[PDB]
Amino acid sequence: QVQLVQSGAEVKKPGSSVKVSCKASGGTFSSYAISWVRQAPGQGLEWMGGIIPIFGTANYAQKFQGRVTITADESTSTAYMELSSLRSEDTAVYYCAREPDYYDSSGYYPIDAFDIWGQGTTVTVSSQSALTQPASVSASPGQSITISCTGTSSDVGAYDWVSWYQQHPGKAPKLLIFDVNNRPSGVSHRFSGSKSGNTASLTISGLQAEDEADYYCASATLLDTYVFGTGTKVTVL
Amino acid sequence: QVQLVQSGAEVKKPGSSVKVSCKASGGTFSSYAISWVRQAPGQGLEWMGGIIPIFGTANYAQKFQGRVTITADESTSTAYMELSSLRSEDTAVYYCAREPDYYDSSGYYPIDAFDIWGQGTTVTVSSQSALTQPASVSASPGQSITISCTGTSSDVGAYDWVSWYQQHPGKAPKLLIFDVNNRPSGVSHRFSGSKSGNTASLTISGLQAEDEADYYCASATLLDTYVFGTGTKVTVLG
Ligand SMILES: [Cl-]
Numbered sequence: 001q002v003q004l005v006q007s008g009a010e011v012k013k014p015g016s017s018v019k020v021s022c023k024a025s026g027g028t029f030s031s032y033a034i035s036w037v038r039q040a041p042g043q044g045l046e047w048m049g050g051i052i053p054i055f056g057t058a059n060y061a062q063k064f065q066g067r068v069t070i071t072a073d074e075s076t077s078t079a080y081m082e083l084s085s086l087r088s089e090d091t092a093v094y095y096c097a098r099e100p101d102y103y104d105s106s107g108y109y110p111i112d113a114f115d116i117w118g119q120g121t122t123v124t125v126s127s128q129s130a131l132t133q134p135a136s137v138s139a140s141p142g143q144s145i146t147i148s149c150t151g152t153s154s155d156v157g158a159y160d161w162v163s164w165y166q167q168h169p170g171k172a173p174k175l176l177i178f179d180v181n182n183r184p185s186g187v188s189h190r191f192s193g194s195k196s197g198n199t200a201s202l203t204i205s206g207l208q209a210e211d212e213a214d215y216y217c218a219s220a221t222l223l224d225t226y227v228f229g230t231g232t233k234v235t236v237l
Numbered sequence: 238q239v240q241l242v243q244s245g246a247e248v249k250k251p252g253s254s255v256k257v258s259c260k261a262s263g264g265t266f267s268s269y270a271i272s273w274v275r276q277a278p279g280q281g282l283e284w285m286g287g288i289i290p291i292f293g294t295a296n297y298a299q300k301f302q303g304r305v306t307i308t309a310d311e312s313t314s315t316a317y318m319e320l321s322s323l324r325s326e327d328t329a330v331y332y333c334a335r336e337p338d339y340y341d342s343s344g345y346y347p348i349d350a351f352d353i354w355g356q357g358t359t360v361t362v363s364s365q366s367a368l369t370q371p372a373s374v375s376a377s378p379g380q381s382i383t384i385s386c387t388g389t390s391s392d393v394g395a396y397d398w399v400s401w402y403q404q405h406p407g408k409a410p411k412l413l414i415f416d417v418n419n420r421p422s423g424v425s426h427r428f429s430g431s432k433s434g435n436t437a438s439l440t441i442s443g444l445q446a447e448d449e450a451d452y453y454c455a456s457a458t459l460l461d462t463y464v465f466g467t468g469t470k471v472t473v474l475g
Pocket residue numbers: 006007008
């Protein structure tokens with residue numbers, strides 16, 4: 001099992017630059033596709049950009065173009081994120097996450113989802129639209145709950161490239177569903193996903209106390225970016 | 238104008254304790270009532286507890302009772318928050334905020350709202366239901382928007398002690414409305430408040446580009462605590 005390990009907390013002055021590392025270990029390869037996603041206080045997950053090291057291709061969200069540089073060193077299986085001209089709004093936990101693309105003699109086969117996440121790096125600075133999700137859901141043990149994720153024809157409604165994540169507060173997210181309804185190995189089939197038109201959904205059946213957490217949807221887009229949902233807190237009564 | 242100045246960023250190990258300070262300056266008359274409110278990554282504002290230094294009384298959220306201690310040193314106009322047994326979920330920006338209670342020769346007059354806020358202190362920890370608000374509201378310039386805030390008869394429905402805040406990214410919250418429908422001096426009268434049963438509403442008329450921000454309601458409670466809403470993001474369209 002591949003693990004992503006990030007560099008430590010950074011305390012920075014406004015206008016300075018920061019460089020965070022993400023070391024991938026435990027697999028057969030050293031060129032995994034890595035995206036950087038941040039989570040600011042009072043905000044949900046926000047995709048910044050990503051790199052495909054074997055091709056040297058980097059892609060960024062318009063919000064970060066010219067401010068963020070993502071690089072990778074295949075010889076040490078490490079990816080990096082450099083953020084310049086730091087401001088108060090940049091105080092956040094920054095995560096690196098792998099996109100589990102497959103390659104063989106016939107080509108490149110992307111998986112537009114984040115299957116493993118680093119532990120996060122807090123960066124604190126001195127002195128398109130998100131997908132809509134309900135803020136909170138509650139139900140009792142053994143019941144089923146369905147969480148909606150509303151987007152547009154340029155994201156959720158375009159193709160089957162919607163994914164879902166569980167995040168316990170202060171912990172890294174965990175992938176539950178990718179490509180609308182596929183479950184990674186290790187995830188219970190209690191978790192299921194679907195979609196209709198521009199609306200995706202996650203159903204958690206057989207609700208357990210351990211399911212109390214925040215849940216996010218995400219989708220790739222026609223702009224070659226990712227967008228995350230606003231997040232839903234699940235409380236088990 | 239009174240300013241609240243907090244201590245610097247803290248990087249702590251799990252299981253340790255942290256102490257954050259809040260110094261008031263710019264005012265003259267007395268020590269002020271202070272609450273501590275945190276904002277963790279991916280979470281809304283969360284009230285922890287507060288103190289009224291001149292009375293020596295303090296209140297704490299049930300979630301934090303015993304793990305948080307709030308104290309004040311009137312001789313240096315400083316309030317403190319100590320949080321013990323730190324865990325990953327405690328990584329957050331911690332704010333101090335003033336409750337502008339005051340007194341005169343005849344008595345004490347509380348104001349259940351947070352009028353001035355410190356700049357925040359990040360605490361990083363090593364490698365009661367919130368009020369219901371809609372996640373998102375979107376409209377074009379010039380339209381009106383209305384944000385609901387649903388609680389219970391022990392909070393929103395109990396008394397006219399509901400307040401509203403605007404928060405831009407990278408900034409502390411700003412008080413817009415207190416006591417359901419009162420506007421502080423300086424706040425545009427295009428912001429107004431209402432309340433019916435257990436639901437309060439913020440109305441913004443003549444929507445402007447600068448109004449794009451997150452908005453939170455808060456209510457005091459019958460348990461002598463405060464509770465915040467989940468927060469609404471307002472998007473101002475083309
Ligand atoms: Cl380090």
